[model samples]
Target: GLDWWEHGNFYQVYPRSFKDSDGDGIGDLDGVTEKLKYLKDIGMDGVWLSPIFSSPMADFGYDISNFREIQTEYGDLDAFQRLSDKCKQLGLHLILDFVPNHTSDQHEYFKKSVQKDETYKDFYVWHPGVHGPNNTKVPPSNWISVFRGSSWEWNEERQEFYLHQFLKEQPDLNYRNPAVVEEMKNVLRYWLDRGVSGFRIDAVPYLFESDIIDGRYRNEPESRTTDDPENPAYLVHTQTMDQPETYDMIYQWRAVLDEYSKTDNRTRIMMTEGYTSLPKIIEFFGNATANGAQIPFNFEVISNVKKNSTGADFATYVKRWLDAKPANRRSNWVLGNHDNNRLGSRLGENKIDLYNIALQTLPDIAVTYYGEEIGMLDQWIPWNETVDPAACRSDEASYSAYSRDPARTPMQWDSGKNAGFSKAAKTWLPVADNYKTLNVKIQDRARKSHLKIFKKLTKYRKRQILTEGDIDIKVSGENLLVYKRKVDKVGYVVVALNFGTEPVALGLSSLFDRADQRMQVVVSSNRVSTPDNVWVDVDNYVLIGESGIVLQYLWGKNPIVS
Candidate 1:
């Protein structure tokens, strides 16, 4: 159950933006392989590749046309295997995406079922047109698609309504159907055989359909209690997935993952993107005395990154995660991912460097987006150039401007043509314009560049006890956020962060009154004169000039053993 991840860093690579080795105007397997050493050199222990499976490219690669095959645009099956092998050779774990809830209409299963083929007809949630209680005229029920309105799309060819939580082109599968469940299981088993260390399950909570509408009936028990219109999932899956039955279906997937875990092969890990509350998520872990995939993802840290959160507000969120799972449940912290804008964009460029310092040293397995480390500025894609279906299809134009599309734009690799990502007639997506000014290659040369700072912060986290220790938030100033990280044999390490306009300060000798004559000024986001206290006074809290500082407690050997 244990692996490099407990102490390693995971870099999420949006396939299209990482690098285009062949220059097909698209990132291919060779492109990712080419960057493995660079990632390793930067201290990344693993890479989480977003979905690269065969797809219609609807909703990006989430619409899988084939689970086992690589999309020709991304590269062939051979390229996919090479990426895996190369990652292992570089001492990196390759975590690929698994979209089990749905598939592209072009998928063979749907293709076969379109003709009412007996073998596959029941594999998806196909129903008679104008179906549902009282025969609704438009859709089967009151459900909204994530891309736009009305989750149900009329399949003229199939002569029935198919449910799609996203674009109508991506139909949700009928997990209740035994054949469908078996096929999903087969997808994981096949990949496990491919020597993949593990998989990150996309849209996992969505694995079942609701037979009820408007409180009339429910195919799943949990569906009955959700009458709130505000819940996006309820609005999207009134007739699709997110049913109470979905939990049972997920347990089935866990059972399959567990089977893989029993083997000597690399411990198969499952990371689910379930938005369900912490307590409900804990039950999903079941019996992981030491470890399991039940790591419920938390977005609070970045989602609501206020300059200063009240003690109660911060404690409320942290406590829920602490109480949600079993003793050994692995909690994770994600600063940003493919679906959201970069934290730097939202938090402001000036404040981002300090946030990076706080982010890497957090108590749990810290997760960061690809370009965020290099302080990649958000690509402001105008409406005419915007490619995200979620933003483009929305009725409101402002939605496209503020939503996730800007964040999903191509990654800025180098100042070269198309940022060295694609050679296609044109990039699949537009590269951020300022890439030449803020790209990996240029940053690598500058000593205090964002990329270099991220590396130093990562190294600092590795050497400090915060990573493998207990956390206690010690509130101090409005612009300041303070906390202590302690571990056996490693002693205590506290972080004092200033997230506001005015600089804040703390005493050095008074804070660490117990012992250790001299502590190292491990890292600082801003330059400051050191005080003379035998210790650096790097201070209890020096003037955290609108930046941040890492207060490391130097301990003896065997620091990592704890």
Candidate 2:
């Protein structure tokens, strides 16, 4: 009942940026439909469409107001359903974004909840006088919002304060209520019945909230929480999200989703956006462990904050994740996403390309963000044009050091106006300026284009064992990260990385016992490492170039067993 998270690779499509069908200066479902063949041809097993649900765009589509209806800015619900159908017909699955933790302040439910309406007032975490009396005093405590400032937004009409983990316009929900829990479950079923293959839960860890320091509200009482460190909050609140009770919450969600996965008609899955560590992730799986997620996207590798770490350091981290398991555990490798700057921008295009080579070869499900294949980067938007609600949380438009909106810009399709993404008289959002040269159309036609290489890599990753195989790591030096993956002793793939600038010679042929057994480089970023036309026997060390190589150990027969 699960989708391609198991062995197949994934490509993320940001609706407003992917393609433009009507030239409305915004991308639409039809635009995405126009590229289904391109998606399949590039070897993506599925597409994770970012939230296209009705929203105020307070957070640029994440501040969901209507879970059931599609935003006209994107298209109608029928269009989304059509997109899903098209994906299925093309042998691709579709996963939608589900934001249950909170809703736009303009949401119908929030509108009702604010008026002390009995139906939803209790449905949300409504604390009357959330800001205590005495206009002269600070609000109750130090709880922070992630967007930049105050976690609590004081509503003069309601005479209460609403919690916002991000922007105040995006109010956080109180999952403490059983009614909220039941409604969310129904929401899951709502789309499941609508034919969506799966869902990507946004802010999955921020589903719950806690009292600010047992009702004190502060980051640190001595100092202000900065209150809500990102914003100015009245008090300190810890364990507001991903609390101890979160384990139970996940167990409950998993149980509910399992009902769909194990349904008679079958085929459903649940994925989460969690930035927690491996141990916390292990906990999230509960008893299901590796089997829990079908796929859990771990950002440790793709974040690139750690990318500069030596290859051995990366290997150690990979080993740590692998060793953290109790067996049968599955995890995903990602290059970048909307939340962070594109990996290409973080590293250079060449280095980022090299890193992608290493990332796709790792023994796990691999996910690539939109426009990443052709090396699209995070555009640097000027202060006057910033559109991210998260960037506005700081109380001023000009203070952001760096914002992620640039990364979420329209995809580069061609060199034409709007980069061929939108034919609109004017785009709803800015397109990356470098598309004239960086557009996917140009790269797709080039012989040695990065996009073509990505297609080949995706084809290579179709092997089931690589995504779910057991990992065996061996350290050759600080500059190289070498490891082996095996599935029932039948499929053995050795991954070697040259973390250093200088080439490191791998005695790969020596690893095997026989000289007569035929062996050749199956995959490599450096063509000079091995002779192009002929297979060779064991001898001295074979040079592994800057990035790495994947070598298949040949026993008595050819390793490609169809």
Candidate 3:
């Protein structure tokens, strides 16, 4: 018996941009609750709300002030309770973004630690400064934070420095302390008891830092990638991340969820976010011997695929994760997120439906960032309007390159004020310019829209051919990429992408195993007319370039999974 999350289509909701219920400029938990039905209507089985925990909003919610409470801006615990209850009523799983790596500098524990309070002294990683030129004191090691500059920040009150892998306002938690580890686990239990089905652990790679003890901590070797020392690219980051202890912590978190599942009889899942290599990231999935994160997240498409990438190139990138993953574990696909450029802006509008098809047609879990179904493009956030610390950190010339604000704009719900995201005159981020014509309200009424196409495209989830099917990816010469999903009696569903700009003759006649293959087009690119003679020859179908075609063939004798 599989659980809802096992093969579920999960959607990630960017908290403040999703919707606003109280005329506030920002979104709230009630806003997400209001949209739960929309998610269910679109065939989503789960929703992962990005950090709504109490925070000072530095680096957004990733810098948590309290783990046991919800942000007032996002609503209180009662609001989360309602969100959880509504998800239950709709048969949708609710997952939370868990940030265990660090806490906001304003957190009581960190503040108490600064005061040298007996019980909270070791709550965060702190170091004694080493002597510098002319009796001057400097940081213990040369660690570069993800936000730029040294990872250590001087604490005048404590006469020492503390570690912050991201921002100075966010200090790394001391996982080496036994009490800190136990407290983090209790946070998990606190949320699990309430209703959270699982977590998407953020910054998994930076959870534990090399211990600072006996007045010494080693510095990471320099990378030859760039000449600018302040840039993170200048360091290889060997000591700060990809540690074995990080995996050990995940195993324990899995244990916490596993134990909770016994009481509720509902399986809890965990997803990880790390930008390391697939070989290292896949380690988050654990092995046949031990349990770890269920979905480590496949982010290859962000840096790998391009607008003009060939079918063979696309197939290679897809197979990279599939081929490297632990065979016993499942795989996943992600198109875009709050941190990256929108799929529409990055891959062009044409690639949206094609990849959405690939996400659903591929085996295992399918992850969708909000507004992706509507093919939302990145909104241009001028330098003056930019609020992201990442973008703010860069100079005017480099702001657009580092800024993720473009992708984090308010969701386009309607043409009305702030794209129906809020009733306030101003939103936290600008509503996209195209929201008038390209929004949920307009798309819902359109005869042909990305939303409509996505709805019809996800209907394949009900087919057994996807949930229990075996997957095989095949690529033709330089332009056609085909992937097949199959089961013994459920038949075959093949999805093909024509990556080039010109027509490619579709030929599955020879590749279709030629064993009583009867094919019919299930869906085609908006530019490609569906089918010719219904269940006719595969070779006769012509693929309009840069578009995709999805078809089904009943295999009574040829091949099977179970």
Candidate 4:
């Protein structure tokens, strides 16, 4: 039942900050092409780049103007072709971020729609405003945008309020219209017709809104999570998110990818992204009757786990995703992303191997953010240096919490100028100061490092049992979180992490189980004092604090994992 995708070695490359081949202090397709071999060596089979499409960058490439064209700073069409060819040569699947929920206001479609061009009049969601006091204007509804303020924007050209769940510059496309659906599907095929493998659909829940009622968008009820009426969290978004039509839209696109795979015989996949409830997230994998996204982008770890979170906490969160998925569906383990605080900084660099071990040893797939494999930490961006619109929209007092810029800083490849990410004196964002000793080149030369352990974890991830075997995840004591990936009569691939800061013994005689027996340390955390290939007694093996250990059953020695 295993496919190539089951290996789950997917990596996310933040195109803007990855590396700059030119002197513009911006990463390009050539930079991505230059690093394909590095990704392959680290065991990444599929790589998803954040939007490099032509955009106004109102939301940092999320507000796309042209779906078919690459952003000029990133590359040209020929540069994309070269990157695609390089991916094929390296046996990598190039997945793109598909922003179907909206388009830049500057998009020709939006321009034509505003001009009321007959064919494009309904391209975007536009509604007439309700009357307010003293001839004043108002938005269609009380719905709030994700970034705050009213979701409806008053457009002067159209003399109507256009819907924008995110930023005003990014107008929501009218999916109810048949033409819009056809247009998006054509966009999907346009990329598929190229060497692109698939897409990671963004903001799926906002794809469709509740049906407009009584010539007006309906108001949402209070969520009661926040006391402030101005906060978006003050109300449950019934009218703007997770509509029934959203799921069908994904299935429709799934049908397109499935249809294309029939010809090339390539297993192109979709990774659906929706920061929503468990029930809805699981739906991205679809039911027995229909297929949706092949990987629904599990965020159990990133969303819940903290530096001091207990083993039971990990057990609960991890199990929630594993337990909720439909039987026989693949799952992904996402530890860090462009939106999240980097694991190195968020959970401490000492815990980097602990999470990476889990990332590789988990059920089906793993999504590693760029620079995460080498323990890249988030950079501290001064208020003046901040470029994230999310932060720009906020005042200096509250911007730190809103800015995703820290996690999106330029990657550290070397100790040289600008961390060798670019020859330019100043990058779009400053490189992390710790790059002097905490970069790829330095880590590569170190005897023990986060990157080395990550590479080791990936080596074991390729094992047959890791993907095909059943998973036994449990909390041994108060802090020892262990997962056993095993195939009966074949072997076991176990990954254990100590969430606590103190050394906790995993083996307890109180439990009547074979897991309390014995195992050898295949890969020990470099942050700890334990040695690799050491025998560990199941009853009293002391697992180092804030560290991870990978184990094999020691079934046989001649062939190592035999």
Candidate 5:
């Protein structure tokens, strides 16, 4: 039997914007439970909710106040229980976002730590600062926060500075403390016992930092490429991130997860969220003697592949991670997420189908952002209405320069007021201008809509040839691409995607063994209304640009695993 993470399609939901049930202009767990049927119909096996935990709204829930409690806006524990039970009943996994890196400054743990309590004093990264001539307090190191400014925030009560990887409102936890580790383990257990199937761990690399040798931390190396001295990336994060001790931290978390999986008799998946090199990402999986993340999210498609990328360029990008990952570990791919721009807007509307096809068939697991199935575009958020802290940086001309608000718009369920996300007169965020025509209800009824194409591909993914077969990239034409999925005697399934603006003629003689074998259309971006049995000549097919087809070869043979 395959593990839960292997054959599942994960749909990420930004809780505050997914759906609202209380008419409070915010989405809650009950809202998610109500939409379970819609999620099932769209073929999502589970949901990866982005931090519905108790928070102070700093960094929008990434700054967690309490791990064991749900956000009040998202509902109480009873609502969570109902959502969990409903997901279990519907055969959908519930994965929570685990922000292991930091905690909200308002958290009791941080408060106690800053108060110099005996038990929790070492729970956070606290250090004494240097006193200047005018009694000016200077931070411990020149380390800059990823969100901007100094990574250390001085506390008047403690007369010391505390480290924060992102915002000062979010303080980094010290994993070196045994008590901190044990407490976090209990937090994991509390959720696991409550029925969360998995966790998408945030910022796995920053769990542990470099050694503080000689009672001082090393400054990050300065980047040579950055012209602006105020840029966060101006300082290379050599000591603060991707430390050697981070893997040990993950191994411990993995062990805790293993205990729960054994007790439940179902695999509890862990997916690490980070933006790093393939080799650095693979390290999170740990060694043969230990275990770590089952699926570390691969974001090359979203981060690397651009509008100018050709079919061959994307092929090489996919192959890099495929070649780097450990054979025992499964790979996951994401085209869009809450942090990134929508696929339609980033890659252009024409390439949405082509990328969606790749996301489904290329990797072991596919993670789709909520509005991606409907080919939703990123909406523009004016500076006056900007909500993202990062986008509000003083150096930026406008929030649109880097604001995530464009991608974090409400889910458009219908053409009604508020796009049917909420029945209220106002929403937390503005609805996309095109929501009237590009919504679930509108796309679901249209035969050639992105939603229909996604549904077709998802249904086709149920075949073992796709879920369990080995992948082989055969043709890498400049604009035309072809790959095959083979399950030994079960036969081969070929996919051809065109990324250019012109039609390309592809000769597919090398894809199959004999011409007598029938090749049927499993799914196609251009022919969404075509029947499944629509036969196409594998020899010579004129593939149109920004389209692709999944062809299954019906060889007269019995199923066998090699």
Candidate 6:
């Protein structure tokens, strides 16, 4: 009885880095389709592909020029159809990245918007610049662009400044305009008609802006200043991000998703990228009656939980989210993505298996970023080699703070040239130096590799108790995390993890009410143990740091309470 999304393990594929066919040094739809078997073999239920829309490549695919057309470098519309057909045949769900916040300046709508054409004049935000005493030009507001400049870009022809929360080449659309709203709806419908299962809605918090209280734009209150004065984080963004109007827009989009799914019989989902406070993130779920985002991407694994976080700290973080969730609202977990630093690099490499176990077991939907399965570490790119617009900004400090190129390197498929990602020696981005040893081919051959472990864990995740059972967490000492999945009258599965350096025996009898229950190791991050005589008796143990174990047992006649 699991929902479509909850039933499968989710994976994120960064198109440009996944695989390159035709010696083009860039991944295309055909290349992705070629690798569908590998994805299926890895036990991935679906993939959330990053933006493949036609773009000028300013912010990579984020600044889309055409919503309907595929980027020529990535492939053509027909190629996309082929990929879609292949996915359906393999029983996989394909999700596209939907960029609703903005479009490239060169986009037809933006071009006409800047020209103030009658039909598209209100399609984008435009306001006259402030006049200074010395005739100097001032932007309309104090808002800062996420890419490191004023959010307002002055257009000479229009004699006004247009809003752009990101780079200047990407202008934000005015969702306040009913025409703009309808046009965006058409964008969703266009893809739905094309058979895309759903979208990973980008920049949900920035979809709308705060209202002008007194006919003037107000400055966002200050948080804390970064050493770099030019960094967008210098401004708190109170008036720009997570505006109230965004929920209404999300509701509208959810309705669009539901409309298609109702008639098509396939559930069309909307997963939003809304990074906010815990309570704020829950709000994205809308309400029990009218859902907004089916899955609001939970990034606490990267944003909140850190190297120094203890088991108790981790438990509290999960509790906060669980407490805020409205009844029947589903949950998701994002372990890694293109925007953040690699998980293996952030948390020690040895800890990846532990985190992966935690990630898959905690949330109903788990998003595994490409290369994470092989435990890829972030690569260091020299300043000259860096191509990220945010990292290439004028400020030196901001480069290290915002540069994401380290996390966007080509995926390592083997020890061969370009890590088997491309036949062309020249890739869009350089392959990591360590790709020679850390690759899929080598790991696929090794019996106890990270890739293999992930495959096994994902397979084991299909258990009814793990997938649909009630969760209860208990912290033992300062570094041990113990949680149980109990399905009434069915059974119980307990997970104990060590977040510290020392090994300690965790008591199990106290956690489970029934003394007659028998527990056996189902999976262990430390060692492959035999289940024959491993049933719980006098001792229940967890390995040293960076280790976890899953124990399956049956509750006595009493049956565990929910």
Number of the top-ranking candidate, with lDDT as the measure: 4
Q: Tell me the tens digit of each residue's lDDT in model 5 across 1-562.
A: 6776787789998999999998988988999989987888888887889999989886899999999999998999999999999998888999999998899999999999999999879999998967878977777888888887888899999988999988999999998888888888888989998998989999886777776778777888888878565577788888888887788888888899899889968889888887766677888877878998887788655678998888888888888888888788788888888888888898878888888888888757888999988888999977777788888774347557678889999999999988899988778889999989988998878767788889987777766678777887865468778888877667677888988888766577764444534478877784444466688777766777788878887554423211
Q: Which candidate comes out best when scored by TM-score?
A: 4
Question: Model 4, range 515-540, lDDT digits (tens) per residue?
Answer: 53777778978877777887788668
Over the stretch 20-124, how does candidate 1's per-residue lDDT look in tens digits?
877667777788889889888877776888988888786789988989898887898788889889988888888888888788989998888888889888887
Residue 424 lDDT in model 2?
78
In model 5, what lDDT does residue 314 have? Answer: 84
- Clash pairs detected, candidate 1: 20-421, 23-423, 24-424, 25-423, 25-424, 212-217, 506-541, 507-540, 508-540
Distance from true location, Cα of 242 in model 6, Å: 2.0
The sequence of per-residue lDDT tens digits that candidate 3 reaches over residues 1-562 is 4666777788999989999998879989999999999999998887999989989987888889999989998999889999999999999899999999999999999999998899889998888868889998878888898889999999989988999999998999999999999999999999999988999999998998776557688788889988888888788878889888898999999999999888878989999998887787888888556799888888775568887788888888888988898777888888788998898888878778887878777888889999999989999899999988999988888899989989999899999888899999888888999988889999899766778778876666566776777887878779799877887765777788888888877787666564544577777666776642266457766787878877777655332222
CA error at residue 118 for candidate 5, angstroms? 2.2
TM-score of 6: 0.94
What's the lDDT for candidate 6?
0.82
Candidate 4, which segments miss by more than 4 Å at Cα?
508-512, 556-562
User: Candidate 4: lDDT of 422?
Assistant: 97
**What TM-score goes with each of the models?**
0.87, 0.88, 0.95, 0.97, 0.95, 0.94
lDDT of 6 at 433: 95
Worst 10 contiguous positions by lDDT, candidate 6 = 553-562
Worst 10 residues of 5 by lDDT: 553-562
Stretches of model 5 off by over 4 angstroms after superposition: 132-136, 510-518, 526-532, 556-562
Q: Note the Cα lDDT for every prediction shown.
A: 0.69, 0.69, 0.85, 0.85, 0.83, 0.82
